[model samples]
Target: QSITDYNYKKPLHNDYQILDKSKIFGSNSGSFVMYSMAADAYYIYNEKESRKRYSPNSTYKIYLAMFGLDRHIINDENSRMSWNHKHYPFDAWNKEQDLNTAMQNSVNWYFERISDQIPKNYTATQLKQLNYGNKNLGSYKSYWMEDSLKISNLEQVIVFKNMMEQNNHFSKKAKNQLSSSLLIKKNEKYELYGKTGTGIVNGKYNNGWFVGYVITNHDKYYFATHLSDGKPSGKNAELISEKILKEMGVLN
Candidate 1:
């Protein structure tokens, strides 16, 4: 197979105007930020720090799912997950779901179970290997489900690229299972597996995230992007992700 030369684009969109404030907030009223990576990394920073890191929130669940599969915590694709909402403080009164359904709907209860099950030490070790959770703490358990989990857009992109590059780390069977479960195209030229996250912080919408990889006949690539300060309506993140996949010739 021939490797396609990487050709990516930089946004002409202004970071201050497009990303800093919300368009729904009347352009300057609401904050709308975006980060894109194709052949190169680009950023539109509305904040003075150049980039900001916030709680990944549910986006972290993808890694948790991967770790669960890697550690054999959950069986295979057909594995069943049952959770009692009463165990947690969150509102999960009607949140009984399986892995597939949980992932599709972005259920908090499902992930909280995985988080609760995996020992903090193990998760911390994994995070370290994944180059996350830089702050010092006692044992991995300390950071497992804290409100402190955070990541920058650039770091998110790096983690995504590494996973795709080292796809072999994931068992072929597991990768195949994950790919089929997440990619929802009934008929498409290329295949993709991904997860979406909407994080609500302090009653304010914080971020919309989509992270995954797309596989074409000749090449495959991973992507991680966020539309901060947007509603979880699926339009913003999905459209951006699909557009990138199409540009890379992975989607028709």
Candidate 2:
């Protein structure tokens, strides 16, 4: 569907009091920003401190997914692998998994394997093309290289905006693949697309996530929220996304 399919209209006002009172919507320690593309607008709910540059965590999966698709590393359909949680040098759970289950469940091993197989330079190249971050790798370490990556809300928004517009930086095939994954399902009320991330940083669980998008027949929009001082489960980016959509009157 095109942007015109829905009876789109600008919001009554840019006021975001409804979001201000909602502490559960974002990390209390950090500020949050929402981009209302339908209105070609933005709303800031807090200070810029918490929104500063930080490790992308699992939210980087969106780009990883894109890279995998573009490099012929994975097909659209789910692919399975043998589970062996104990195989890891660390104590975390090891298990066999497919791409769909890995993504839906946010399995670390699946992504870790992908990161291991795909050279760091290749991944870094993709990130640079997307203008992801400072591209800083003062000293290279294979596993930690990807982990050390960072991004700000503005940068994330720009990458996403480019994706939506299908800019030349992203191959048409790659763009189409990402869009297909994001647009898995669409309806009159809203079109949902998203990815989740949780990783250990400075002895704490850092949760970074995204779940917002171009609404069917409406203006394109994206909501990116992050938390840095708690476990990923408590942060609940998906639930927060639903709340944001509901507040925007895109959902009931």
Candidate 3:
């Protein structure tokens, strides 16, 4: 099923802006959505595509990490998964990894092992509480890939907000650990935390995602950027999103 079945309500805000970021997006079929909690506003580009759903690719690993920590399957400090001794494409993905290394490298096997340790119903219930897209774990292991589970750009933003507002299902330590794990770059002006996901279906790199938030002194801004078709990649999505944020004066 598509997003038509269940959708989270967008927060009521008077400062909704549908921006023309065609030049920034350039040739890639991309969409970006950002929500500023301080101003209670939305900045959206490619609104039509922003409403469409796409597999979260590796971006879903963020939640999987949280699930592992919350369930005591792993913890902040002792979160390491030994390598199966199988060689992979990237050199970084070939060795033993802790949560920080695994997340930064987007290690498939590390997160896959985490999923193996977590109970299916527990993950499902947490997904429900998160109001995550589709809330469907279609396949046991690869659902969050390009298989069954999916999320739209707007849904991604809302999910982050929901995750932050949550204090019951997840522990404070888990939340703090995950936040530090997602840190990409930080400066005096803003602290940027993001996760990137790349989709390779039938051996084609067609979808990419970069989603997370930024923290300034006063407010938090959650955003999601998705790129589809035409050699899209998580790295590319990151570059595009950074440009957009800078142009909007969110970054300096």
Candidate 4:
């Protein structure tokens, strides 16, 4: 009867629309998936890659933030973590970080410090409840950064939709705080919320991810785009998502 024991299935409501690969993907090999709430349909590129699972990488921080908030380890207003004075290559990671700054900067140490405070079992259980990816925390501290915790592009869309659509596992405040932390842009017509993640394995930038949703005046669209097999970058992945979104006229 526990949530962890539950098996979650991907919803089948609408049809798939294969997006043009060359126009959006260019030279990179990647996959993109988008779901429209109103139409109950999906738009995808690279059908094969969409189902392939890879590390969640820094994208895992999005979920960790929610967990941290739920446990009262941190809250919306009191989410600052002191810098340990450890020198990082990125200038942004060198100073004090709050939830918003840490997330926007993608500071590894900040989230790792937060994760250290939470029991591994608790996160694993939450992953199950959220039906996130393969639900494997792996046998290491940073399971999401490598070939451990894995998820597909299609799975990412579904899991993100689960988190944004309802308050199933986390508190309303936690969800609201996480959403605000992820806000990238807001205009009268639409608001964008997303997270980008890069997977650097053995000094190679092999995986990149940009996943989240956009709320427009008429509808909501959830999307996930992941690039692999080359010099993939989270920043580029974000651009790719935006290009497709623009093409679909979801964003102007």
Query: What TM-score does each of the candidates earn?
Result: 0.67, 0.71, 0.93, 0.92
lDDT per residue (tens digit) for residues 36-91 in model 1 = 33434333333332134544556676677777777777757455666653554444
10 residues in a row with least lDDT, candidate 1:
1-10
Number of the top lDDT candidate: 3
> Model 4 segments beyond 4 Å from truth?
1-14
lDDT of 1 at 215: 62
Error of 2 at 185 (Å): 7.5
Clash count, one per candidate: 7, 8, 0, 0
Q: Deviation in angstroms for 208 in model 2?
A: 4.2
Model 1 RMSD vs true structure: 8.8
- TM-score head-to-head 2 vs 4, winner: 4
Candidate lDDT (C-alpha), each: 0.54, 0.56, 0.85, 0.85
Model 3 Cα lDDT, one tens digit per residue, 27-138: 8997999999987888889887887788898899999988888888788669988899999999999999999999999999999988998888987888888878877787
Report the poorest 10 consecutive residues by lDDT, candidate 2: 1-10
Candidate 2: tens digits of C-alpha lDDT, residues 1-252: 223211212232444432462556544344345666656566655435333665566666666666676666776564466775457654333666666566666666766666656776886677667666555543434332234456654455556766656556557766666655555347776676666655655755565455446564656677666554443432465566566666767653
Candidate 2: residue 246 Cα off by (Å): 1.2
Evaluation by TM-score, superior candidate among 1 and 4: 4
What is the TM-score of candidate 4? Answer: 0.92
The CA-based lDDT of model 3 is what? 0.85
